[PDB]
Amino acid sequence: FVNQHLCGSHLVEALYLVCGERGFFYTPKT
Amino acid sequence: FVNQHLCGSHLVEALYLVCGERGFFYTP
Amino acid sequence: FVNQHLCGSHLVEALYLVCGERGFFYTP
Amino acid sequence: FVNQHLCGSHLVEALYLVCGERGFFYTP
Amino acid sequence: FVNQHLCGSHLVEALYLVCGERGFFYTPK
Amino acid sequence: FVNQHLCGSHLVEALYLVCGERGFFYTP
Amino acid sequence: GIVEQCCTSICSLYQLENYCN
Amino acid sequence: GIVEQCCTSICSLYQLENYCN
Amino acid sequence: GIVEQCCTSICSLYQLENYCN
Amino acid sequence: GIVEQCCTSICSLYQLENYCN
Amino acid sequence: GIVEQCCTSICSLYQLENYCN
Amino acid sequence: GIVEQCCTSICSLYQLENYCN
């Protein structure tokens, strides 16, 4: 739903900060 | 200046939207 | 309300990316 | 240009905030 | 749902813009 | 200038995340 | 308007182009 | 403070100005 | 206009208000 | 997944790190 | 990788798709 | 301050956590 869609966008930006140069894997998969 | 890090931050947001449920690796 | 306010904030971003050089109108 | 692409993304966010219900055109 | 957290995320971006060179404190709870 | 303006916008977001419950002062 | 279409349901990028100039 | 004031009903830019340094 | 005027130089929220309908 | 666990309540730093590569 | 491809000239959404899973 | 520190080179999490209250 729209909530989780808006939330995912903040998750990806936190992952970007957290993981730094490691990078990361974003998967919305349940 | 810290430009590619700011850029990477917009790039991951753009990928979020384009990739959808597929998702993505972000590998610098 | 706020839910709508944050939503629009992310819509405007998505519209900025998809619309490109053409641009967009944002009128709630 | 990416610097301009990054800048317009923040501009669009600031206009969204500034213009409230009035909305706005973004026309590069 | 993490609504306060998302909310504060936009709050601090609005404060960044409203407060310009004066800056701000963000002191949650 | 503009680049510091775009950067600080990111720093504020990053401080938000990092500082969690404690919060933060942004001074430019 | 756009808030009824897209805040109440996810507008994909393809749908979002209806709102371009 | 600000979360309580601003997270269900929209605060105008002018209301947010109270939280500036 | 906006990009030229606001990406070389920082526009206040005040001057951004010109671009509001 | 990350959504059902991080969106319903706040994820810790270490929980986020799960997704680092 | 992507930073090199995409941080001087704008990668379109099309080109960004290449980085998807 | 932070702009001088962190807009010239990338600040780590530990560096940024210097500006937390």
Ligand SMILES: Oc1cccc(O)c1
């Ligand atoms: O339907 C929506 C709502 C908010 C952001 C977005 O990309 C799509």
Ligand SMILES: Oc1cccc(O)c1
């Ligand atoms: O009430 C709020 C919440 C988030 C951003 C904003 O400008 C206002």
Ligand SMILES: Oc1cccc(O)c1
């Ligand atoms: O002049 C500008 C450029 C980008 C965002 C902003 O708030 C102001």
Ligand SMILES: Oc1cccc(O)c1
């Ligand atoms: O649990 C969450 C959800 C969104 C952003 C974040 O840092 C944590």
Ligand SMILES: Oc1cccc(O)c1
């Ligand atoms: O090439 C780029 C760089 C940053 C964001 C974007 O959407 C495209």
Ligand SMILES: Oc1cccc(O)c1
């Ligand atoms: O040095 C920086 C600049 C901007 C965001 C950030 O997390 C770090």
Ligand SMILES: [Cl-]
């Ligand atoms: Cl949000």
Ligand SMILES: [Cl-]
């Ligand atoms: Cl930027």
Ligand SMILES: [Zn+2]
């Ligand atoms: Zn948001």
Ligand SMILES: [Zn+2]
């Ligand atoms: Zn930016």
